[PDB]
Write an enzyme that holds these catalytic residues in place. Structure first.
Site, PDB file in Angstrom:
ATOM      1  N   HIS A 181      -2.762  33.520   7.369  1.00 56.50           N
ATOM      2  CA  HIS A 181      -2.479  34.271   5.984  1.00 56.50           C
ATOM      3  C   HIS A 181      -3.723  33.919   5.071  1.00 56.50           C
ATOM      4  O   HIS A 181      -4.178  32.759   5.205  1.00 56.50           O
ATOM      5  CB  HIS A 181      -1.115  33.640   5.451  1.00 56.50           C
ATOM      6  CG  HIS A 181       0.024  33.930   6.405  1.00 56.50           C
ATOM      7  ND1 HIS A 181       0.807  35.164   6.493  1.00 56.50           N
ATOM      8  CD2 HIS A 181       0.636  33.135   7.240  1.00 56.50           C
ATOM      9  CE1 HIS A 181       1.824  35.139   7.388  1.00 56.50           C
ATOM     10  NE2 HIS A 181       1.709  33.574   8.001  1.00 56.50           N
ATOM     11  N   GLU A 219       0.580  30.329   1.975  1.00 54.31           N
ATOM     12  CA  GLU A 219       2.011  30.827   1.945  1.00 54.31           C
ATOM     13  C   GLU A 219       2.641  29.491   1.066  1.00 54.31           C
ATOM     14  O   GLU A 219       3.014  29.664   0.039  1.00 54.31           O
ATOM     15  CB  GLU A 219       2.466  31.296   3.152  1.00 54.31           C
ATOM     16  CG  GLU A 219       1.964  32.232   3.797  1.00 54.31           C
ATOM     17  CD  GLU A 219       3.104  33.047   4.513  1.00 54.31           C
ATOM     18  OE1 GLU A 219       3.467  32.370   5.597  1.00 54.31           O
ATOM     19  OE2 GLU A 219       3.016  34.280   4.301  1.00 54.31           O
ATOM     20  N   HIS A 264      -1.019  29.101  11.118  1.00 50.93           N
ATOM     21  CA  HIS A 264       0.443  28.710  11.587  1.00 50.93           C
ATOM     22  C   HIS A 264       0.270  28.696  12.979  1.00 50.93           C
ATOM     23  O   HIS A 264      -0.108  29.875  13.611  1.00 50.93           O
ATOM     24  CB  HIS A 264       1.369  29.949  11.012  1.00 50.93           C
ATOM     25  CG  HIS A 264       1.695  29.867   9.627  1.00 50.93           C
ATOM     26  ND1 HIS A 264       2.404  30.906   8.931  1.00 50.93           N
ATOM     27  CD2 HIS A 264       1.493  28.838   8.570  1.00 50.93           C
ATOM     28  CE1 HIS A 264       2.595  30.557   7.780  1.00 50.93           C
ATOM     29  NE2 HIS A 264       2.087  29.242   7.572  1.00 50.93           N
ATOM     30  N   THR A 306       8.225  33.753   7.690  1.00 51.19           N
ATOM     31  CA  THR A 306       7.765  33.952   6.324  1.00 51.19           C
ATOM     32  C   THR A 306       7.377  35.565   6.250  1.00 51.19           C
ATOM     33  O   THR A 306       7.154  36.189   5.269  1.00 51.19           O
ATOM     34  CB  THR A 306       6.288  33.167   5.808  1.00 51.19           C
ATOM     35  OG1 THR A 306       5.273  33.912   6.819  1.00 51.19           O
ATOM     36  CG2 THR A 306       6.634  31.831   6.016  1.00 51.19           C
ATOM     37  N   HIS A 330      -1.561  32.233  14.012  1.00 55.57           N
ATOM     38  CA  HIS A 330      -2.096  33.249  13.009  1.00 55.57           C
ATOM     39  C   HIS A 330      -2.457  32.618  11.807  1.00 55.57           C
ATOM     40  O   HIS A 330      -2.027  31.581  11.373  1.00 55.57           O
ATOM     41  CB  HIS A 330      -1.228  34.365  13.052  1.00 55.57           C
ATOM     42  CG  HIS A 330       0.123  33.809  12.580  1.00 55.57           C
ATOM     43  ND1 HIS A 330       1.234  33.549  13.300  1.00 55.57           N
ATOM     44  CD2 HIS A 330       0.672  34.021  11.290  1.00 55.57           C
ATOM     45  CE1 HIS A 330       2.265  33.032  12.502  1.00 55.57           C
ATOM     46  NE2 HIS A 330       1.867  33.346  11.232  1.00 55.57           N
ATOM     47  N   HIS A 358      -0.107  43.150  10.329  1.00 55.44           N
ATOM     48  CA  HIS A 358       0.169  42.192   9.321  1.00 55.44           C
ATOM     49  C   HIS A 358      -0.840  40.927   9.507  1.00 55.44           C
ATOM     50  O   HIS A 358      -0.915  40.292   8.212  1.00 55.44           O
ATOM     51  CB  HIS A 358       1.602  41.605   9.445  1.00 55.44           C
ATOM     52  CG  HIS A 358       2.767  42.790   9.873  1.00 55.44           C
ATOM     53  ND1 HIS A 358       3.107  43.618   9.020  1.00 55.44           N
ATOM     54  CD2 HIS A 358       3.437  43.036  11.112  1.00 55.44           C
ATOM     55  CE1 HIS A 358       3.728  44.534   9.382  1.00 55.44           C
ATOM     56  NE2 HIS A 358       4.081  44.346  10.711  1.00 55.44           N
TER      57      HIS A 358
HETATM   58  C1  LIG Z   1       6.953  32.110  13.563  1.00 56.79           C
HETATM   59  O1  LIG Z   1       6.170  33.266  13.903  1.00 56.79           O
HETATM   60  C2  LIG Z   1       6.462  34.360  13.495  1.00 56.79           C
HETATM   61  C3  LIG Z   1       7.091  35.184  14.295  1.00 56.79           C
HETATM   62  C4  LIG Z   1       7.624  36.569  14.074  1.00 56.79           C
HETATM   63  C5  LIG Z   1       7.358  37.013  12.772  1.00 56.79           C
HETATM   64  C6  LIG Z   1       6.494  36.299  11.701  1.00 56.79           C
HETATM   65  C7  LIG Z   1       6.198  35.226  12.099  1.00 56.79           C
HETATM   66  O2  LIG Z   1       4.922  34.327  11.582  1.00 56.79           O
HETATM   67  S1  LIG Z   1       5.375  32.896  10.552  1.00 56.79           S
HETATM   68  N1  LIG Z   1       4.915  33.145   9.006  1.00 56.79           N
HETATM   69  O3  LIG Z   1       4.892  31.860  11.303  1.00 56.79           O
HETATM   70  O4  LIG Z   1       6.976  33.097  10.114  1.00 56.79           O
HETATM   71  C8  LIG Z   1       7.458  38.611  12.289  1.00 56.79           C
HETATM   72  C9  LIG Z   1       8.329  39.086  13.384  1.00 56.79           C
HETATM   73  C10 LIG Z   1       9.279  38.524  14.278  1.00 56.79           C
HETATM   74  C11 LIG Z   1       8.583  37.459  14.991  1.00 56.79           C
HETATM   75  C12 LIG Z   1       9.448  36.427  15.980  1.00 56.79           C
HETATM   76  C13 LIG Z   1      10.516  36.963  16.830  1.00 56.79           C
HETATM   77  C14 LIG Z   1      11.195  38.347  16.356  1.00 56.79           C
HETATM   78  C15 LIG Z   1      12.308  37.725  15.459  1.00 56.79           C
HETATM   79  C16 LIG Z   1      11.373  39.447  17.337  1.00 56.79           C
HETATM   80  C17 LIG Z   1      12.663  39.115  18.197  1.00 56.79           C
HETATM   81  C18 LIG Z   1      12.374  38.505  19.432  1.00 56.79           C
HETATM   82  N2  LIG Z   1      12.065  37.689  20.285  1.00 56.79           N
HETATM   83  C19 LIG Z   1      12.047  40.605  16.155  1.00 56.79           C
HETATM   84  C20 LIG Z   1      10.956  40.455  15.130  1.00 56.79           C
HETATM   85  C21 LIG Z   1      10.077  39.221  15.527  1.00 56.79           C
HETATM   86 ZN   LIG Z   2       2.643  32.729   9.509  1.00 50.13          ZN
END
Ligand SMILES: COc1cc2c(cc1OS(N)(=O)=O)CC[C@@H]1[C@@H]2CC[C@]2(C)[C@@H](CC#N)CC[C@@H]12
Ligand SMILES: [Zn+2]
Length: 258
Positions: free
Chosen positions: A94, A104, A117, A196, A92, A62
């Site tokens: 985007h 974003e 981010h 996001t 990371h 992703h």
């Molecule tokens: C804040 O950073 C992120 C974390 C997660 C995702 C995307 C993210 O990027 S963003 N743009 O900053 O929101 C997508 C997958 C998510 C994970 C956070 C932890 C989660 C909720 C896991 C559970 C745990 N620990 C399951 C899916 C995971």
């Molecule tokens: Zn992000």
């Protein structure tokens, strides 16, 4: 058929698997600079990355994550709208297929070439997994990237991308200093939001810096050489891995500057 950024699994499809996609505090959002109001109650923002310990870089299909060792309080974010200490766990980006899109969050509807981010979790919750289940579990520092002069501190990241071209690939990435990715000013906008990408949990306090950092066309071009697919599969360039602005609804974006 899991989520992605394509026509049949992109952002407009996420709500079926993740209903919260249409929730009350979804991210990203457009930042209306004229409606955002200065907030005197905001404390000085504190970004202490001097003791940050990076460990590795991963292509998760992703985007790519530069992960840090968060078993101790080292690189932390505090102050501003935050109560307590938030520990840096990873960062990371985007980005888009073209310089005119990729971010974003948007500022007065303007899209930047990319968005960084820096993810942190509230230490009072013990671990990252527990933190994401809380309304104030995470704090993400967002930084816009525009194309112009190269960002010296980003080259280390750019040069290791060839080693993690496809989904699932990771590489050692120690001693990377995130302070080299910060703009001069810490002026920012803040609002309560969410992750996001699926599962889109509404556990994030967003802090988006007003000043973008400049990266060269060559640097962003290498981001665009990454793959969404895994090794040995048809090449799907990792570009436009951003979610569009979501309804602000019952929220107010606060500014740290007058
Ligand atoms: C804040 O950073 C992120 C974390 C997660 C995702 C995307 C993210 O990027 S963003 N743009 O900053 O929101 C997508 C997958 C998510 C994970 C956070 C932890 C989660 C909720 C896991 C559970 C745990 N620990 C399951 C899916 C995971
Ligand atoms: Zn992000």
């Amino acid at each position: 058929h899991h989520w992605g950024y394509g026509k049949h699994n992109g952002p407009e499809h996420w709500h079926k698997d993740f209903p919260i996609a249409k929730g009350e505090r979804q991210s990203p959002v457009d930042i209306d600079t004229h409606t955002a109001k200065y907030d005197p109650s905001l404390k000085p923002l504190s970004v202490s990355y001097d003791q940050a310990t990076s460990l590795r870089i991963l292509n998760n299909g992703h985007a790519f994550n530069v992960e840090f060792d968060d078993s101790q309080d080292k690189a932390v974010l505090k102050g501003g709208p935050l109560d307590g200490t938030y520990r840096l766990i990873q960062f990371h980006f985007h980005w888009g297929s073209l310089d005119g899109q990729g971010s974003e969050h948007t500022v007065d509807k303007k899209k930047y070439a990319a968005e960084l981010h820096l993810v942190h979790w509230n230490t009072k919750y013990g671990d990252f997994g527990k933190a994401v289940q809380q309304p104030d579990g995470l704090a993400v520092l967002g930084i816009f990237l525009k194309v112009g002069s190269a960002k010296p501190g980003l080259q280390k990241v750019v040069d290791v991308l060839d080693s993690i071209k496809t989904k699932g690939k990771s590489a050692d990435f120690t001693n990377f200093d995130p302070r080299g990715l910060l703009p001069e000013s810490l002026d920012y906008w803040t609002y309560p939001g969410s992750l996001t990408t699926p599962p889109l949990l509404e556990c994030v306090t967003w802090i988006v810096l007003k000043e973008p950092i400049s990266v060269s066309s060559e640097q962003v071009l290498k981001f665009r050489k990454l793959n969404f697919n895994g090794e040995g599969e048809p090449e799907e360039l990792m570009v436009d891995n951003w979610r569009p602005a979501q309804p602000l609804k019952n929220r107010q974006i606060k500014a740290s500057f007058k």
